[PDB]
Enzyme design. Structure first.
Site, PDB file in Angstrom:
ATOM      1  N   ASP A 124       0.827  -1.220   0.000  1.00  0.00           N
ATOM      2  CA  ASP A 124       0.000   0.000   0.000  1.00  0.00           C
ATOM      3  C   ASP A 124       0.858   1.265   0.000  1.00  0.00           C
ATOM      4  OD1 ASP A 124      -2.323  -1.551   0.138  1.00  0.00           O
ATOM      5  OD2 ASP A 124      -2.382  -1.465   2.330  1.00  0.00           O
TER       6      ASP A 124
ATOM      7  N   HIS B  95      -5.628  -3.552   5.458  1.00  0.00           N
ATOM      8  CA  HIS B  95      -5.382  -3.874   4.057  1.00  0.00           C
ATOM      9  C   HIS B  95      -6.616  -4.490   3.389  1.00  0.00           C
ATOM     10  CE1 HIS B  95      -2.930  -4.511   0.531  1.00  0.00           C
ATOM     11  NE2 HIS B  95      -3.335  -5.768   0.484  1.00  0.00           N
TER      12      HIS B  95
END
Lengths: 314, 314, 314, 314
Positions: C150, C177
């Site tokens: 990310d 996530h």
């Protein structure tokens, strides 16, 4: 009550082949072998509402148990072609595969019918024969190189061009199973059909290159699987029918032959209770067909010797 | 004479299903659709010596051409389960697949019979119906959730326990196609069979969890493919037979229903030229079977609403 | 001189991850584990001209040998998403995979840094924690849900929008996530970047949906593998640098947390010789970012309870 | 500043090779080509936080767009070996691949460095040269057969036997990349190492058969991928460094040569801004090494001829 083993049952040909076999009331026991995935394939097939008992076997340790008491063994196991490859390019890998599996057949089910699909058939049948000779159990009436897909294709292509039902077309195909060794006897087709020489040459070419056509169409995802499953199933059913005493069962297959100077050759075979009842031979053919036979013999002999020489180094 | 489309023809179920359809004398045209590999599969199947004309289509741009003039559309398209998954874990992915494909069917072959295999069937049939309603062409007699594998399994398992031929056994299975919604009516089995309750409960459980058993057996290599192809083919052939005027054709299938408080439900259906001719209903059932129906209804209604709400968000 | 184990080394992430580790001067021993293909992967990697000793382990018997003496364990093992699936749809398969593998870690290398890549991370880290608790060896400063991809994505996308060198961009990403739980803190980016709202909104969404973007692009051939290998390797190298005594090593990771009411949460972490030295917390954020944290909390709590409940069913 | 094309980017070698190139600050633009999966691979790699701009290209219609402006083209494309196969078995497939891809290079980026990994390298480099000759753009200083994996292996094996850091070991390997044509010059190894003939023979055989060893270990799951990605990346980086004016860059590679009677041969090459700056030749060798060179020349000549004849048939 036929007991059939499928060696290479988890592969692209093996799975749909095992399905067709399971669906038939001719099969009473279906034993499936591979190096991976067989238990899952067996569980899948075991749920189908037919009588055939399905058993899965995994790894060389369980191979003897798979073959024990089998009437017929079919061997679709083998690496498929990629676009650009010849069937001969697969020899080195598939030769080892066939030698190993047929050695187990010789040891554990020597009386069974052995049907080899693994390419190149023109070399792998000679390997199978020599392996059986090594074990002292060679019966040339029981070892078959499956060329049935050539006949299935020939029937379909003739039917399409002449607007016929392919179910009622029969084209004998002789020689071997590679390139120019595939010799479709259009002159012996039933019903009788007449093509001009240019169209006949095109039809013959397409039959010969049909396998490569499919390999190209799949674009790296292997070779013929579903039609090969169909053709392999057809051959096994013919063989099983004949073993049960069905009469008039004729199939072309690459076998030990004395029809030409080639020691192995494909021609129409009358099948019976002991396997090959009678080799029906080449028969009356055209000049064009005679020319193809002549041109094919050199490559056939070379493919045969290659397979024999491989077994000599074991 | 039937024109059959297979949506998801390159998949695990799709390929062997397409093979069985190509082999059938009931099929005159076989159009195959997928997002990959379809041309290779079509080329493969086109070589088989049967009348069915095979054509492969690739990508959503070619989906309308695949559906044009179809009589039956079979949808094996869908992601398979991995070990541990429930069928509802596939909801998001397979709901989108079914919604997209059935929308194309509504536009391009609204009169066709729609046979949905894609799981979870308890939700995907509601999805199909709502998509057809949105396009204003909803005919509840022509949309079928294929539960036939449950019946095929029930027949096989009963036949194995009683030592019968599975071909002579017929077990009605009602409800839906997930876990405890699969309700095998052993009390309506032909021929009549008697199990003590402990064996009957074990048999019932085996039928209910058979799909999960195969997933576990395949150990990551997907779910039932070959037996599902068989079961899918069986349903299609029954349906096509009934469409040609065959009488007495009865198959269980998950459809729009007023037999229970559930708006969709699986019961034996008399098939005909217009699709569902008559819903034959649940009939008389044991106390054990009555309890299973009562316990299943909440899950069925939940799955139905889930599918309806999904289409509602689109 | 770090000893690193890769569990799931033969998979899509595992193989390139193993390559990046083998190439690194920070790694002195690389042990590889999977249930298939590991010997071949290890043989391949063992030829590379770097110092790390490579060993391949295969099957449960050899899992303990892979883990003994390890400083860091990375667990890319797990089934990937198909288009249309959420990460949560993978829970019921990957939960058992993570439970089994982390149990072996708890037994055989309880002092190692445990880096879990297997999705859904928001539930699989809670599983890992509860497994370690059951074995009486839970150290929350050594268990890491790898969210590094990310951050890598955010750095890349910011750099592309502003025309910067992505090596000189650092965007903190917090939360978890999965979709809306991924919270890029563009306000805390270095260098400070000012985007017009429409670009900021599009940037934030792109970061949140980047995984789904790659799944869509791969069209059924899995999820991010090469970039996940990069991100996983980055996190391991940061861990090893910190373990070797490097100062100021900061990485965001999903860990046991008291920054919010969520028991697990990702924030920037100062890493040290014993894992987490200091959780640096959420810090100063914008109103837009605060609202994203509020929206994420309910989903995170749901995901966390799901992982906790799974272990309680065992 | 370097723009690098990877032709065959979706394959076993291609994907990890593309990863290593994306990770390098020597690469500013990375273009990826294949006939399947490239969009997914590109999307994946495009998220990595390095400066290289990644773009994916799919199918022959987009190949020209992939190649335009490229400084280096690396060609890992090609079918991998199965157990049993020789590298020669791949000739027919990989020759066609290389012929097609290098034709596109000659047409769209004739000034690029061409690095061929596709085997058999002993024939595919001659194919590449003749294809460039047909388009009137043949520059023998820019066409490289990548043999770097042989050197990487030799370094590792020597280092392991002497307990050295493989980073400080350098073994020249000359000849070609197939069996007995792989000639490791242990007498020229740095640092100086001394083996008795029996050890030297086994070490030499180990290097020669290393590729086959990995094929065996992978047991049907292909050939070397991760170490080939490492070796391919090493060679590309050496070349790109030399193109940036770095001095003293030396790599062995199979190139157009006048060092022996073979028209193509591998020796140490000083690389520079023109590609091959100087061929450093075989140098002083032992009797053992002299003998290997003599025995290899016949096979090399045949492989070169086989490649040249292939281009004539096009």
């Amino acid at each position: 009550n036929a007991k059939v083993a499928v060696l290479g049952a988890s592969g692209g040909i093996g799975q749909p082949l095992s399905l067709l076999l399971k669906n038939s009331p001719l099969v009473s026991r279906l034993t499936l072998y591979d190096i991976a995935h067989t238990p899952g394939v067996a569980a899948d097939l075991s749920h189908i509402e037919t009588k055939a008992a399905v058993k899965g076997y995994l790894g060389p340790e369980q191979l003897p148990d798979c073959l024990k008491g089998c009437d017929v063994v079919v061997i679709p196991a083998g690496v498929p072609r990629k676009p650009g490859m010849t069937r001969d390019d697969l020899f080195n890998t598939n030769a080892t595969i066939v030698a190993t599996l047929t050695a187990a057949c010789a040891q554990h089910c020597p009386e069974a019918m052995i049907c080899v699909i693994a390419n190149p058939v023109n070399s792998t049948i000679p390997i199978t024969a020599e392996v059986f000779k090594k074990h002292g159990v060679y019966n040339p009436n029981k070892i078959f190189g499956v060329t049935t897909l050539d006949i299935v294709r020939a029937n379909t292509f003739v039917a399409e061009l002449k607007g016929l039902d392919p179910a009622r077309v029969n084209v004998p195909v002789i020689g071997g199973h590679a390139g120019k060794t595939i010799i479709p006897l259009i002159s012996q087709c039933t019903p009788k059909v007449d093509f001009p020489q240019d169209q006949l040459t095109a039809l013959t070419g397409r039959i010969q290159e049909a396998g490569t056509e499919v390999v190209k169409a799949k674009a790296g995802a292997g070779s013929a699987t579903l039609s090969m499953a169909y053709a392999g199933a057809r051959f096994v059913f013919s063989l099983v029918d004949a073993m049960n005493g069905k009469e008039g069962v004729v199939e072309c297959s690459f076998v030990k032959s004395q029809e030409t100077e080639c020691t192995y050759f494909s021609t129409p075979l009358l099948l019976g209770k002991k396997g090959i009842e009678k080799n029906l031979g080449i028969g009356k053919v055209s000049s064009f067909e005679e020319k193809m036979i002549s041109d094919a013999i050199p490559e056939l002999k070379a493919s045969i010797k290659k397979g024999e020489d491989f077994v000599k180094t074991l």
